[PDB]
Design a protein around this ligand. Structure first.
Ligand SMILES: *C/C=C(C)/C=C/C=C(C)/C=C/C1=C(C)CCCC1(C)C
Ligand SMILES: *C/C=C(C)/C=C/C=C(C)/C=C/C1=C(C)CCCC1(C)C
Ligand SMILES: *C/C=C(C)/C=C/C=C(C)/C=C/C1=C(C)CCCC1(C)C
Ligand SMILES: *C/C=C(C)/C=C/C=C(C)/C=C/C1=C(C)CCCC1(C)C
Ligand SMILES: *C/C=C(C)/C=C/C=C(C)/C=C/C1=C(C)CCCC1(C)C
Ligand SMILES: CCCCCCCC/C=C/CCCCCCCC(=O)O
Ligand SMILES: CCCCCCCCCCCCCCCCCCCC
Ligand SMILES: CCCCCCCCCCCCCCCCCCCC
Ligand SMILES: CCCCCCCCCCCCCCCCCCCC
Ligand SMILES: CCCCCCCCCCCCCCCCCCCC
Ligand SMILES: CCCCCCCCCCCCCCCCCCCC
Ligand SMILES: CCCCCCCCCCCCCCCCCCCC
Ligand SMILES: CCCCCCCCCCCCCCCCCCCC
Lengths: 287, 290, 288, 286, 289
């Protein structure tokens, strides 16, 4: 064995206060995000609405997931005057985060594929692979770090992390391919944003496998604090960073369709205070 | 005697797996509910019953699963690498029946809504399908839970059979109503409705099979299997089926627009392929007003 | 006889499981109903919107009320070797249901009067009487069965049940009159629906006074279970049954107004997959 | 010297009555909130402040009453002697002040919104009415609750008077603003605004009266009366008044449509009598 | 030395405990009323100035929820005794939770002001990024000083990080003031006035917080602790609701102007204090291939 489970380390008051701070700040950030996303939903044509429903879906999940993580944290440690001593439920703080990823991540794939130019079967096939891939990716990490021998077995810990990375690559490929195919068919302005969005998501993803392995280099209140806070900052930045990008895309693509006279939008579309499309109504129709 | 699944002690691995799938399910339903709500106006007023049913069922499922999760947390007491069932452990199974009682009937309504059945033939079908599926569940509940704390092997098997009676009645009514619609629909609609019907009616089989596993003994592993399988079943069927009936309603809505039977204020898309164009109703005067 | 309070009877596990089942199934049924009602709100012209706001209002109340009933139930009984033994809070299970009716019923009256053709003072007067009548009707039953001598006094129990029935009749009259007056001025199709809706509500109402008196024929876990479950089935059927009807009415009346060119509706109106009206916009207007 | 009402032990009959009215109130507000939300677009953009205020106040009232109910359930312990007050029994009365503090000012705004007040005269009135009613409540809170656990008969009466000062200031500001509007309104609008104003300003009297009952002694019966009366008062005033200001906004909206001052995308009705017809704005080119 | 007297160490009278709760809950309810008003009046503003609305609703939602936590922390923070209300371990959380609130609520306040400002392209996106991270850091610093470091007893860190905080504070004030002073020229007289007003309410009020931060240095007392808690609550409510109402009035004026200038169209008439600003208009109907 080399695995020092992070829910074994006792926390100082400073650490316990910092973790809670970032946890709740995260939850509230997601509430603010969810609200913003909901209110700005009709800034996007019916064609790119899957991007919106996915974004709102994932923010809703993240929000609720983080409430559980917060609850688990509050019931996971006991104050002893010698610090905060982990109880049996301390593992749930890490357990709950996997639950989050299991649902939140697949929605992130769907959101990216939605702003991609994939059509018909090529689109539905990609989604199916990306979803099941990312789903499996998380579920594997869960088996290694949590489920199997209370996450103490160094064999399984490393084994399933690798099995996970297999699925990870499958995902990266499917997404990168689907993006690389779209960029040509898009305008210069759209091209740039989709590339940006794809990077923010696929780039950030790297942080997680790195943090997964830190428990191998030992155990400590400081390490455990780092693991918890990093993943929180990671979750917030990726989810809100990426989401904002795919939105800006959907709007650009919507505005383009309006300008190209492919469709009409009942309100004017703006980006950084620069008008993109004008408000228009459909023709009145006789039966 | 019947080996009740809420008698079996769970390992930490098992307790962790059950919770994982339970909460993942609940959150999947949150995501589904939100998606369904946001995409509600992609469907004509004619097929709105399909939407209200889908949102209704996802809302119920969501809340039901919160109860199941709570029951699970209060159903077992930790014992140094093991979780020992308490008196409330039965409620984990009890609560799932409560879910089905409401969630399933809504699934029937949702399918019949996208079907072409018209007038009283339609309203009669719904009435039978609903009461049938309602009774189907309530029966299984009496057998597995209510009667002699679900230990009586007689009642357990008896009411499971009475249940299966109602089950068939439902399958018939639905299959008939679908087989009648498919002819009068287009090729593209025809395919989807058939698909949706299969996902629902096919998946249904899993449940009676899982109901009887308690007869082949009791074990942490079995109990875990029963709980997880039903969760995966619930999620796949409800979200799998729901997505299908939606794609139908949109196709049927787009068709009505193209056929010039109605108008829709936004363009309708499926897999990024345009189906209908946005149109407004003609501006009209009044024969008499203020 | 003599009054055997139903919150005195000990429940078997089978009974305790059945009550909870129906209670929660009810609550969820109301969630589904509330959602459906909300989504289908704009299927009705501004003229008949009072019908919708009332229906959604009552479903919202019912939903929340039943959450309280469920809470009361969970805190009302303690598990023992002898089954589920009533504690002091067991009375609240019955107490809470009265609270529900007090609000949910008056909304049911308003909902029916909304789809009625009553105009001006005749309309506002009817509502005022029906509401206060049904309100008093419930509050009376509450005094008899719960408030007065912890609902053990057989005198008050029967007395106030009668005072209640007085208000009950006043309501039935006001509603029946208001309906019978509308039916003439309505179309054949509307006429039929309003009659149907009125029956479902006014007919079902009978179940409640009947169940009120069962505590006189003794007390048992079986009886208590019957009282609780019957009232739940009653609540669900009446509220959802009736509600669906008044909706079908409002839509028909809305579609008619559109066809008669009296008003316009921005979407096509359907009933059992049969189109009733077509989508229309108002004429664009130039301002002085 | 003052017989605090949270000192009195309650019978079962009393405890059951209080809870009944408390929850019935909360549910009445749920029904009201829902109605208000659904009927929000029956009013022109001009009188929307009336709607946002009404929905705001119903939302507050609803939540406030949930707290009052919770406080009630945690305020008394069942014994051989009935329901005996614990330390938290005061919170039942405490929580109601919290409600008024927010719910009342919104009631002022709602009335001023359907008034014809324009520019500074409007913004000034609101500012005074809000701070006036806010202070009015906060004063009563100091007297009855905060100062010496509301036992000091001096402060109890003192701050009740300071309160009444603010009370009058409010009545004046509102009455003035209404009396100025009634001339510029139609006969039908004139009547409604007067009605609404009475329901609010009239009902207000009940509260100061109930505030002083604790001086004529303490008793389960009195405490029950105080609690139930305030509940009936809250419900009647809030949704009685609210229904009126709504009927006003619709009339004023319909009038603007008929006068060709504005357009409304749906037909407006009152007691089944059509007021305005549905109309769209003219299409605009650029 | 340890001259910092933690406010969560002071025992509270019944009068004080009652006052704190009163203002806490009144605040929460004020935010509920605000959130509702904001949501209902969302479509009084053109798509161009929607970021102003989403930010305001976002911040009111956060404030609302944050205050629920503060209230819960308060109820679990003190135990009633013969000697009044005695602080327990969790009493610090009452102050801890308020920092959490500010961390999110404040940055949204910056975004809301920048949204009604005329900043365009990168100059706009850059300003927001600085203002957000600046205000974020500003709060997080105060948190380290008053709470995290040596349970907020270390007078060194307390004063040190308060200064580091004030650095970020100024950076924010500058970015916002600059962005406002640049907009005022390109705006009308009526808009100019409102934006200036809104900016004052926010930037002016901000001063109260650093002042209250340092009161723990003058000693400790139930009365002081009560003052700290109540003041911050009144501050939060006034700033958030005061400022928010103003930025709204701006967005509407700017929306109405665009309509009158024939730059855009709005489907309903826009009013301010019962004075019409724009008339309802529809976009031209369009036929497609
Ligand atoms: C918003 C939440 C996000 C983006 C979470 C992402 C998580 C991962 C990309 C996790 C990947 C992992 C591996 C590829 C190996 C080790 C185990 C995981 C699950 C951490
Ligand atoms: C989303 C939830 C669904 C589709 C649940 C379905 C449940 C059934 C089809 C249950 C059927 C049963 C029988 C026919 C026999 C044994 C008892 C039941 C209730 C499991
Ligand atoms: C949805 C809930 C409904 C329709 C409840 C109805 C309740 C009644 C009609 C009750 C009537 C009663 C009497 C006329 C006499 C006995 C006491 C009552 C309250 C049960
Ligand atoms: C919906 C709630 C309402 C209208 C509450 C109104 C409360 C008052 C008008 C209270 C006034 C008081 C005085 C003028 C003197 C005594 C103390 C008060 C606060 C009861
Ligand atoms: C609605 C909430 C608001 C506006 C909160 C504002 C808080 C501040 C401006 C805090 C500033 C501080 C300093 C500049 C120094 C001391 C520490 C702080 C965080 C109180
Ligand atoms: C809208 C804010 C809700 C806050 C969450 C509180 C959850 C439930 C608690 C209710 C409070 C109990 C009754 C009042 C006690 C106040 C004690 C005091 O006087 O300080
Ligand atoms: C792998 C589990 C994650 C499931 C998320 C799927 C998103 C649900 C949306 C479906 C719409 C119906
Ligand atoms: C459908 C998935 C079923 C999984 C069952 C897992 C059984 C538990 C393993 C431990 C023995
Ligand atoms: C019934 C409608 C919802 C109830 C929510 C109340 C939440 C407060 C619970 C606080 C309990 C204190 C012990
Ligand atoms: C939708 C109705 C649910 C009621 C929940 C009552 C409390 C159950 C335990 C949590
Ligand atoms: C098992 C004993 C209780 C059974 C009584 C149930 C009565 C249901 C009536 C519904 C109408
Ligand atoms: C932290 C556990 C208790 C949470 C209570 C939240 C209640 C919010 C609504 C009350 C009004
Ligand atoms: C049981 C004695 C107390 C009853 C008081 C009822 C007060 C109602 C006031 C209505 C106005």
């Amino acid at each position: 064995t080399n695995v020092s489970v992070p829910w074994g380390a006792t926390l100082s008051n400073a650490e316990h206060q910092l973790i809670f701070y970032f946890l709740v700040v995260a939850a509230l950030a997601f509430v603010a995000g969810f609200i913003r996303t909901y209110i700005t939903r009709n800034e996007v044509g019916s064609r790119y609405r899957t991007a919106v429903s996915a974004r709102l879906g994932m923010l809703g999940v993240a929000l609720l997931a983080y409430i559980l993580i917060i609850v688990a944290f509050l019931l996971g440690y006991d104050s002893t005057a010698g610090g905060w001593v982990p109880n049996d439920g301390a593992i749930n703080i890490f357990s709950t985060r996997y639950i989050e990823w299991t649902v939140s991540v697949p929605l992130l794939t769907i959101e990216l594929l939605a702003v991609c130019a994939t059509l018909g079967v090529q689109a539905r096939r990609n989604t199916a692979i990306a979803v099941t891939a990312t789903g499996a990716m998380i579920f594997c990490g869960f088996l290694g770090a949590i489920v199997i021998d209370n996450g103490t077995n160094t064999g399984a810990f490393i084994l399933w992390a690798v099995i996970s990375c297999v699925f990870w690559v499958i995902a990266n490929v499917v997404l990168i391919r689907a993006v690389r195919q779209s960029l040509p068919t898009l305008t210069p302005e759209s091209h740039t944003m989709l590339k940006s969005a794809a990077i923010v998501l696929l780039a950030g993803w790297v942080v997680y496998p790195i943090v997964y392995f830190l428990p191998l280099f030992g155990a400590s209140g400081g390490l455990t604090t780092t693991i918890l806070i990093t993943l929180t900052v990671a979750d917030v930045i990726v989810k809100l960073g990426f989401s904002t990008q795919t939105h800006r895309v959907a709007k650009l693509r919507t505005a383009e369709d309006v300008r190209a006279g492919d469709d009409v939008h009942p309100e004017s579309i703006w980006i950084s205070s620069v008008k993109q499309s004008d408000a228009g109504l459909p023709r009145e129709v006789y039966l």
